[PDB]
Structures are given as structure tokens and as C-alpha cells.
Design an enzyme around this catalytic site. Structure first.
Site, PDB file in Angstrom:
ATOM      1  N   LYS A 108       0.858  -1.180   0.000  1.00  0.00           N
ATOM      2  CA  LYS A 108       0.000   0.000   0.000  1.00  0.00           C
ATOM      3  C   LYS A 108       0.898   1.235   0.000  1.00  0.00           C
ATOM      4  O   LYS A 108       1.981   1.212   0.588  1.00  0.00           O
ATOM      5  CB  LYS A 108      -0.911  -0.014   1.228  1.00  0.00           C
ATOM      6  CG  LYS A 108      -2.129   0.889   1.139  1.00  0.00           C
ATOM      7  CD  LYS A 108      -3.032   0.677   2.339  1.00  0.00           C
ATOM      8  CE  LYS A 108      -4.173   1.672   2.372  1.00  0.00           C
ATOM      9  NZ  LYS A 108      -5.099   1.394   3.503  1.00  0.00           N
ATOM     10  N   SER A 160      -9.496   1.646   2.356  1.00  0.00           N
ATOM     11  CA  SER A 160      -8.583   2.433   1.523  1.00  0.00           C
ATOM     12  C   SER A 160      -7.491   1.601   0.835  1.00  0.00           C
ATOM     13  O   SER A 160      -6.667   2.143   0.094  1.00  0.00           O
ATOM     14  CB  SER A 160      -7.962   3.574   2.337  1.00  0.00           C
ATOM     15  OG  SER A 160      -7.229   3.084   3.445  1.00  0.00           O
ATOM     16  N   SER A 161      -7.497   0.290   1.074  1.00  0.00           N
ATOM     17  CA  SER A 161      -6.581  -0.625   0.391  1.00  0.00           C
ATOM     18  C   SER A 161      -7.222  -1.178  -0.885  1.00  0.00           C
ATOM     19  O   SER A 161      -7.090  -2.364  -1.197  1.00  0.00           O
ATOM     20  CB  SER A 161      -6.163  -1.771   1.319  1.00  0.00           C
ATOM     21  OG  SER A 161      -5.732  -1.289   2.580  1.00  0.00           O
ATOM     22  N   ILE A 203      -8.167   1.595   9.905  1.00  0.00           N
ATOM     23  CA  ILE A 203      -8.605   2.432  11.024  1.00  0.00           C
ATOM     24  C   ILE A 203     -10.135   2.556  11.031  1.00  0.00           C
ATOM     25  O   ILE A 203     -10.732   2.995  12.016  1.00  0.00           O
ATOM     26  CB  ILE A 203      -7.906   3.826  11.010  1.00  0.00           C
ATOM     27  CG1 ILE A 203      -7.911   4.452  12.412  1.00  0.00           C
ATOM     28  CG2 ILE A 203      -8.520   4.750   9.949  1.00  0.00           C
ATOM     29  CD1 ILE A 203      -6.810   5.473  12.643  1.00  0.00           C
ATOM     30  N   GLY A 204     -10.752   2.148   9.925  1.00  0.00           N
ATOM     31  CA  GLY A 204     -12.205   2.138   9.778  1.00  0.00           C
ATOM     32  C   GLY A 204     -12.695   0.947   8.973  1.00  0.00           C
ATOM     33  O   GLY A 204     -13.888   0.834   8.685  1.00  0.00           O
TER      34      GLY A 204
HETATM   35  C1  LIG Z   1      -9.522   2.811   6.281  1.00  0.00           C
HETATM   36  O1  LIG Z   1      -9.576   2.191   7.571  1.00  0.00           O
HETATM   37  N1  LIG Z   1     -10.625   3.748   6.152  1.00  0.00           N
HETATM   38  C2  LIG Z   1     -10.507   5.054   6.796  1.00  0.00           C
HETATM   39  C3  LIG Z   1     -11.791   5.825   6.501  1.00  0.00           C
HETATM   40  C4  LIG Z   1     -13.067   5.044   6.836  1.00  0.00           C
HETATM   41  C5  LIG Z   1     -13.023   3.619   6.282  1.00  0.00           C
HETATM   42  C6  LIG Z   1     -11.810   3.365   5.386  1.00  0.00           C
HETATM   43  O2  LIG Z   1     -13.255   4.956   8.257  1.00  0.00           O
HETATM   44  C7  LIG Z   1     -13.576   6.168   8.954  1.00  0.00           C
HETATM   45  C8  LIG Z   1     -14.568   7.016   8.187  1.00  0.00           C
HETATM   46  C9  LIG Z   1     -15.222   8.069   8.823  1.00  0.00           C
HETATM   47  C10 LIG Z   1     -16.130   8.849   8.110  1.00  0.00           C
HETATM   48 BR1  LIG Z   1     -17.023  10.277   8.970  1.00  0.00          BR
HETATM   49  C11 LIG Z   1     -16.383   8.580   6.765  1.00  0.00           C
HETATM   50  C12 LIG Z   1     -15.727   7.526   6.131  1.00  0.00           C
HETATM   51  C13 LIG Z   1     -14.818   6.748   6.846  1.00  0.00           C
HETATM   52  O3  LIG Z   1     -14.171   5.711   6.221  1.00  0.00           O
END
Ligand SMILES: *[C@H](O)N1CCC2(CC1)OCc1cc(Br)ccc1O2
Ligand SMILES: *[C@H](O)N1CCC2(CC1)OCc1cc(Br)ccc1O2
Lengths: 543, 549
Positions: free
Chosen positions: B114, B189-190, B210-211
């Protein structure tokens, strides 16, 4: 009014605790006159556990003998704050296959116990008994160990002295006019005098290492999350920039390793999965391979006493004769790490969460003007910062960091600590080190002076910011030659912190001096391995 | 502040597209010279073989390190013409090919990276204009251990701008497309990793989370991905848009076609090399006895999280894997984590946007805003009072938007500590609930199937199944189980949502026309027990897709 009522009721609990302790030991001594108390107390913990495992000494014998000594030393030290009642029932229901079977373990007041107050020296926390034991107490009971008493702490635990308006003032077992350390001052006074063979204490600025050096015992501060912080009581919750750590306190370093081996079992990682399942690496602790040891005689921030400087050189020379290579190593930007990173991390909110506990409560003189300075407005702190900057750079930079910040400023600080942690590791790798030798703040300071000598935490709080496992071990006694040379002491800055510290370390003949040992993060066994080496070369009587 | 324009961002993207085009040219010249040397070398037999058989033939000496390299390199070039997942080819990899340690566990293995993973002499743009033209001085810790274990890193995969979106599009390198369907998103995001591995260009890859950044593209493209505990692998050298954020833990892990390759990657990374270069990571060895264990597991499961409504494909996938685990001998217990809306609306959104995204918006100064992020940037730029005003107005009608907008406000250092304490209390809460039912592992319906282009950034609530375990710091993995049938896509007209706000409407439209797309399931284990997580992931894979083992 409310603080007066809370103090009176806390002293009634302490009186009832001591009366229960005295009537229990006299009940045992008269029923068992055959038992030798002197040979019991002088016996090291490693020799104590093997006699308990075989059955040479009964769990009843080792418990009430140490309880008898704990009550006797409390008269001149005032370290015991509360006696745990249901400990006698736990004695009979102790697991035999536990590593700490039938071991009396002293606890710091912050360690929550079922049906007991964790006052921390505050009025609002008095009258609120804990309904459940904390994870680290739970695993001690599961490993055979029986916690017997709570130990006294300074008000709010934010001082390396030991005094609170509720239970009183803790005193050093060696000298009456001296501080036993803090915030585990009760632990230092008890174990140092022989009231407890094993103990537990917290650390965020040096709270394990301070009382251990002041009383002449061994204390280890592990990494931030090597042991369970669950169930622990504090004033400020959520502070992660400066890592809080809990660790063991004992007479010798061998007793610390067996305590750490006991707590690092399956039961800890089951009761608290947040802690990584790192077992006690016996291979690393028992190691006898020559170490590349980094050292520094001074941090160029707080001038070491003649007793400290002699203790650092003597340890160095003993290690050089043993076969260890000693390399002059000093962490980068120390004043930067203490003034804006360590002080800024602990007081990011301006102490507003901290001062919330002091509403309608007395302030102990052992803290000094710590409360009066924090209660000042943000603009008033900044105004005195750039005004006293040309006069005294230490007090000015500390006062600016005690200002409230935003969420953006916290991340900027959090990243700077993460950069600083990697920068010292980069120097650790470049110089190729296994362990680090450090002077420990000694000897014991006078009563009600540690709070006024803030800069003295420089040797300890640095490795809370770095989150490095740091441990101390008594190496030498203050000779009257060292105490005499304290008249030539001046300090690098000459500010109030240097003036008070000069007076506080005087008249210290007979007091013990310790030396700090620092290893890389998550290497507690490697830190204890070096602590085993330092103890063996300096004090061969132990081990 | 004065506007700088977009002129600096325009020239930066022009030079970014060139580094992409020159990379593909270098890749093409390299694979053509090898095919002239080896005409009888079978490509299809090389690519179809799993990583486990690939590493065994590399260790024994049946296949040369050059053979497996240029076959996968050519496959990566071919799939990029239809997916657009490769940003840059790492030039200093052919020298690493010959320098790869023979005794290494990942010897001769081509590993995709990445873009956040910093490589020596290569840009970690992350989609931002200011980050390009800024090469890394050295390789990051986790890339260094790959080289030490014999693995050869060859390409950087595509990411969405700032990495804060589960789509995959940036103004500097373009838009990534799903290898299964052109109009569908490859995740994020990957997203570059998912598109490359899912098509067969890479046997193993790494990505941040992280999400749900490992889990999203894994489910969208139909591959295996593991997100371990935040501090189980080294974060040192990994370039991000925001620094100092510790409330919600950032985690990195492996991505591969099968689950057995993930455990080999975790075993190879967890060695003396990792703990020496980064002492902040605890020296935990990969427990083989836990992973190889075939003992019955107490599995917790739920069909829905009562926040984001699962698609008919998600519902069917969760039930099918639940029933087949019961047939194997595992006991399935109805389990749901307490206060899920609390973890997402105020803990996750409040933790990631404590400053109101002030440090986050620093990267977007004088730079293009990619449509895949949606209104995320325009919402964050609003003042604190305007965020509060709309929060009170939208609360009676749209409760989800009110709590999310209020948590995206700048607060004090005092309120951050209260929030950070509320996270560790909530972590202890679900752990206490875990023990109450005495669970070994958890089963979660993973967000599926693949969403449409430029819709993930407008469907924020969809991260409910993934960001929950970033806030909890629970090791979570994803494994493909079944594909979308004609019946699954037809039932999308009945789909409404639990709240009926704009997030449920767009997500309804984004999951339409999905026949043939893969749908995965999520596996969650206790903190620091990712070797137990992979053990359960192996059990799910064996019962749903036995051909992979
Ligand atoms: C990778 O982990 N990633 C970061 C952004 C993400 C999901 C993809 O997680 C947090 C988040 C928060 C909001 Br308000 C909107 C979108 C995301 O996507
Ligand atoms: C125990 O770890 N302990 C906490 C407070 C202490 C040392 C004793 O460290 C931080 C600090 C900061 C100031 Br401004 C004043 C006093 C202390 O002591």
C-alpha cells in the site's frame, strides 16, 4: 466541613484497623510460642516460598508474623492506612499450586479491594468502597498470595512525598525527619522496615522508584501496558501521553522477578485481554552474557548529590570488572523532554480534571504550591512564563506547559512523544545497547520538601514519557563524607528547585542510595537481569 | 486565508501520472526480456497455485525466484489495464531479488505494498499534492522485515485521497475499479490491494486499517484480509495524513487469496527483525499451536447490528456460515455488542475528528477534492457553531447525522481525555459481555456486496460493521463465503434501512445490479489473539470454500 467529617471517619477506620491487627497477632503469638519470629522475617522471599511449598512453614505462621512486624513499624512510620478484613478467610482458601502461595502482599491504596475505600487522600473518594477487586489483586489471590493491608499515599498521588489530610503523614523508617518517598511512600516505609516481603505500586512520574531509593528497597516500573491497569483508582482518567505503569516492590530483585512471573500468567490475560500475552521470559532474566551498558553520571538538568555520583561510579567500576562494556550514553534533548513533553502531557487540560478533586478539601503542605499554581488562569500562567524566562528557564517552561490545550494541540504533542521515543531508540541502536545505567534521585529528602523540588523527577519521569521499563536497586549507604560534600552543591540553574533540594538532602547519614536501570520497551526481564547484576556486585549479601 | 488555487496540484498530478506510465513501461520491458529467455515456462500453472505450494517449490528449488517474479509482474501489468490499481513500480526490486535470503520464510515471494508504506526513493502521496515529489529516505520497518524474510516488494497499490474513504480514487493517480465489475468500487482504503490480489496480480499484500481499510476491499473483491491489534505490527515509517491520533487505533495486516497465506505472513513478520527495529511492538511470537487447533469453539453471532441494515446477500451469507459451523460441531450463541451506536457516533467519529478535522484539512489546502470522498471535506470545513446548529436541527428527524456532525467538532484536551477514557471503559464493557456468554470468537456480517463508484463517501453509516472493532481494538478478519444470486439483488427493492436517512437511500442504490459479486463474512477475536482469529477464519473458509484448502 465535609473534609473535616471525612478525615474524622477515616481515622476511626484506621484505629479500628490497627486494633484488629493487634488483637489478631496477640491471638497467634500466645497460641504459637514455639514459632521463631526473628528467623521468619530475616528469611528472603525465595527461601520463604520454598518452605511454604514443602510445608516447613504454615501459611498461618508467615502471615501473622509479618502482620505483627507491620503493626510494630507502623507506630514510627504511619504507612498502613487500612487493614483488609477478609484476608484471614482467603488464607485458608489459598491455591497450593500458586507461585506465591501464602505470601503476605502489601497494596497501594489506588489498588481497589472489595469493601474498602480508595481515598487517594481526597474527601470525595472517602466513603466510597470498591465493590470488586482489581485484576492484579485477583491474579494474586489466584496465585496463592494473600493481600493483608493498604498503604498510605500522598494527597492525589501527584507528589513524591507521602502525606494526606485524611490518614496523616508517612515517615521514613531510617530517619524520622525524612520523607519515605512517593506516591508509594507507604509501600517503601513498610517493606523497607520489614513489614512486608512483597508489594505493589503505581508510577507516572517515578512513584515506584522514589520510595524504593529513599527506603532502600527494590522496585520495578514495567511498560505502560505490561500489567493490567483495570480497576486502578486515580484522579485523572484518559491520560495516555505519559504512560502510567504498575509494578512490584520488594527487598531484593529476585523477589521482583518471581512476582512478575506470577502476575504474567494465563489468569491475567484471561481477566484482561487488553494486556498482550507476554509470558515471563526466564531465558532473558537468568542470562549471564556480557551486556553493552550505557551510562551517564548526570542528566545536566538536576545535579546529582555526592552520594548519587559515588553510587553511579562504583556500580560502573564493578560492572567493568565483571566483564561488561560501559559506554557513555545520554538521551537527546532532556530539558525539552521534561519541560514541554512530560509536563505538557500530564497537564494538557491545565489540571482542570485534577483540581476537580480538590473542591471543598484541604491541601497538604507536602504538595506545596502545586495546587495554587494550577488554579491560576491560562493568561496568568502565560504572562509569568515569558516574564520569568530570562530569570529562570526551568520554572518558566514548566508553567507554560501547565496551560490548557485543544484536541489539535494534544495530537501535536502525542506525535512529538512518538518521535522522541523513536529518536532515543535510534541512539540506542546506533550505540548498540542492551541496557542503561542511570543515577536515582537520592538520598531521602526532608518532610514537606519534595513538592517544592519539582525538577528532581528528571531521572524518573523521562522514562515514563519514553515508556521504558525502569527499575531501582539499593547499592550503597550515605557515608558522612558524602553528606559533608553536600555543602558544595549548587545546581546548574540555582533556582528554587535547586535551593530546596540542597537543604533537603542534608543530614542524611545512614540513608540508602539506589541506582536506576533502564531497558528497551517490553523488556522487563532484561531490565531485571541487569538489576540482578547490579545487586550482586554491589550488595553480595542479597542473593 | 488566501486561496493558492489548484495550479500546484495540477502539475503534481501530471508528474504523478508519468511515474505511473514509466513504471508500466519498465514492467513491460522486464517481462518481455524474460519471456524471450523462457518460452516453455507455463504462466497459468504458476499463477493458479496457492502461496503455500509456491513457497515450498521456491525453498526446494523446483521454481527459480526469477520465474515466479516476472510471471506475477506480467499478470500485475495485464490486470492494471482494466482495474487501475498500481501507482508505481519499485525500481530497486530486481537487486533485492538476488539479495533475498534463501533461509527466509517468504523467500522469492512477490509482495504488493500500500502506498502508505514508505519505500526508499519512492513517493508516499496518499492522494495528496503536497506529499508527492517527496521520496522516502529509507524503507519502513514492515517493508524491511519483508526483505529480510526473502520477500520481494515490487509495486505500490492505489489509495483514495487522504486514505479516509472506503472507496479508491485520487486526483493524482486516478480511480481504481473492481476486477469483477467495471461500475463497482474495489473497496478502500486498500482498494489497490484488493483489485490486484482479487484479479491474481499479487499473491500477498499489506494494508492499513482504522475504519475497515483491510476488510472493505477484501469483501468487495473477494479475498482474505486480516486486521490484527493496533500494536501487533510496526506502525513506524507508515505515512498518514494525521499524526498523534491514539483514540482510535490504527492497525496493519496481510491480504491474500486464502487464509493460510495470512498466517504465514503474520508468522514471517513476527520475528526478531520486527522487535529489534521497532521495540514499541511487544515481542509476541506467532502461536502455531493455537492456529492449528481443531477444538470446538463457542461462537457468538448476529444477523444485524441494528444500525446499518444488511443486504439480502449479507443476511444469507451470515446464516449459511452459521449453520455449517453448527454442523461441524461448534456451538453458536446469539450475541450482540452493547451500545453499538455509541461506539460509532461519538467514540469513533469523536476519536478520529477530535480537532474537528483541523489537522486533516491541512493536507487539502490548495488541492483537488476527489468525488469519491463526497461532502466529507465540505462538512469538516464548516465552523464549530454551524456544526452545532445543524446538529440540533437534524436531531429530531435524522438522529444519525446529528451525533456524527456533533462529534466532528473541535474540543479541549480535557474532553479528549474523557473520550479516551470512555473508549477504554467501552473496551472493558464488551470484554465483560464476552466473558458473560463465555465466547471464544465472534461472527459478524461483513458489509457487502461491492458498492457503486463514488457512493462509499456518501454512505458513511456502512462502516458500522468494521470501525466498531477499531474503536474496540479487536483483531478482525474477513473471508469470502458466497456470491450474489439473482434472488439476492432482486430483494433490494424491499430494502429500506433502520433510520431512513440519506445514507440508507444511497446504500440501497449502490448495492443494486450486483449479481455475481462476492460477499464475505467478518471474524472477530479477543485483543492480542489474532492467531485464534485466523484459526476460526480457517474453519469458516474450509466449511464454505473447501477448494481453497
Ligand atoms: C480505512 O480504515 N478507512 C478510513 C476511513 C473510513 C473507512 C476506510 O473509516 C472512517 C470514516 C469516517 C467517516 Br465520517 C467517513 C468515512 C470513513 O471511512
Ligand atoms: C508518582 O509517579 N508521581 C506523580 C507526580 C510526580 C512524581 C510522583 O510526577 C509529575 C509531577 C509534576 C509536577 Br508539575 C509536580 C510534581 C510531580 O510529581
Amino acid at each position: 466541613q465535609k473534609a473535616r467529617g471525612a478525615a474524622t471517619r477515616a481515622r476511626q477506620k484506621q484505629r479500628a484497623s490497627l486494633e484488629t491487627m493487634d488483637k489478631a497477632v496477640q491471638r497467634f503469638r500466645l497460641q504459637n510460642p514455639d514459632l521463631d519470629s526473628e528467623a521468619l522475617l530475616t528469611l528472603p522471599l525465595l527461601q520463604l516460598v520454598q518452605k511454604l511449598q514443602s510445608g516447613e512453614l504454615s501459611p498461618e505462621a508467615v502471615f501473622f508474623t509479618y502482620l505483627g512486624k507491620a503493626w510494630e513499624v507502623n507506630k514510627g512510620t504511619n504507612c498502613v492506612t487500612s487493614y483488609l478484613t477478609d484476608c484471614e478467610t482467603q488464607l485458608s482458601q489459598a491455591p497450593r499450586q500458586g507461585l506465591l502461595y501464602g505470601v503476605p502482599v502489601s497494596l497501594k491504596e489506588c489498588f481497589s479491594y472489595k469493601g474498602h475505600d480508595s481515598t487517594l487522600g481526597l474527601s470525595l473518594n472517602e466513603g466510597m468502597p470498591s465493590e470488586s477487586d482489581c485484576v492484579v489483586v485477583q491474579v494474586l489471590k489466584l496465585q496463592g498470595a494473600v493481600p493483608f493491608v493498604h498503604t498510605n499515599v500522598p494527597q492525589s498521588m501527584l507528589s513524591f512525598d507521602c502525606s494526606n489530610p485524611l490518614f496523616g503523614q508517612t515517615m521514613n523508617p531510617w530517619k524520622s525527619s525524612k520523607s519515605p518517598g512517593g506516591s508509594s511512600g507507604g509501600e517503601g516505609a513498610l517493606i523497607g522496615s520489614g513489614g512486608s516481603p512483597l508489594g505493589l505500586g503505581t508510577d507516572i512520574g517515578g512513584s515506584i522508584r522514589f520510595p524504593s531509593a529513599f527506603c532502600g528497597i527494590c522496585g520495578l516500573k514495567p511498560t505502560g501496558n505490561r500489567l493490567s491497569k483495570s480497576g486502578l483508582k486515580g484522579c485523572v482518567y484518559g491520560q495516555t501521553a505519559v504512560q502510567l505503569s504498575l509494578g512490584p516492590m520488594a527487598r531484593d530483585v529476585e523477589s521482583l522477578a518471581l512476582c512478575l512471573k506470577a502476575l504474567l500468567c494465563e489468569h491475567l490475560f484471561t481477566l484482561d485481554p487488553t494486556v498482550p500475552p507476554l509470558p515471563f521470559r526466564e531465558e532473558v532474566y537468568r542470562s549471564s552474557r556480557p551486556l553493552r551498558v550505557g551510562y551517564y553520571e548526570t542528566d545536566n538538568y538536576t545535579m546529582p548529590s555526592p552520594a548519587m555520583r559515588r553510587a553511579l561510579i562504583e556500580t560502573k567500576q564493578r560492572l567493568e570488572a565483571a566483564g561488561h562494556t560501559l559506554i557513555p550514553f545520554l538521551p537527546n534533548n532532556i530539558p525539552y523532554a521534561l519541560e514541554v513533553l512530560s509536563a505538557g502531557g500530564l497537564f494538557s487540560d491545565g489540571g482542570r480534571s485534577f483540581l476537580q478533586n480538590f473542591k471543598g478539601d484541604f491541601v497538604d503542605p507536602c504538595l506545596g504550591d502545586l495546587i495554587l499554581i494550577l488554579r491560576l488562569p491560562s493568561w496568568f500562567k502565560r504572562l509569568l512564563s515569558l516574564l520569568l524566562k530570562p530569570l529562570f528557564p526551568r520554572l518558566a517552561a514548566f508553567l507554560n506547559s501547565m496551560r490548557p490545550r485543544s484536541a489539535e494541540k494534544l495530537w501535536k504533542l502525542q506525535h512529538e512523544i512518538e518521535m522522541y521515543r523513536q529518536s532515543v531508540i535510534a541512539q540506542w541502536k546506533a550505540m548498540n545497547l542492551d541496557v542503561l545505567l542511570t543515577p536515582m534521585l537520592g538520598p531521602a529528602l526532608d518532610l514537606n520538601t519534595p513538592g517544592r523540588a519539582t525538577g528532581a523527577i528528571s531521572y524518573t519521569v523521562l522514562y515514563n514519557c519514553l515508556d521504558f521499563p525502569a527499575g531501582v536497586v539499593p547499592v550503597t549507604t550515605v557515608t558522612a563524607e558524602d553528606d559533608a560534600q553536600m555543602e558544595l552543591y549548587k545546581g546548574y540553574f540555582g533556582d528554587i528547585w535547586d535551593i530546596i533540594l540542597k537543604k533537603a538532602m542534608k543530614n542524611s547519614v545512614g540513608l540508602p542510595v539506589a541506582v536506576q536501570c533502564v531497558a528497551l520497551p517490553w523488556q522487563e526481564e532484561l531490565c531485571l537481569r541487569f538489576m540482578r547484576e547490579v545487586e550482586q556486585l554491589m550488595t553480595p549479601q542479597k542473593q
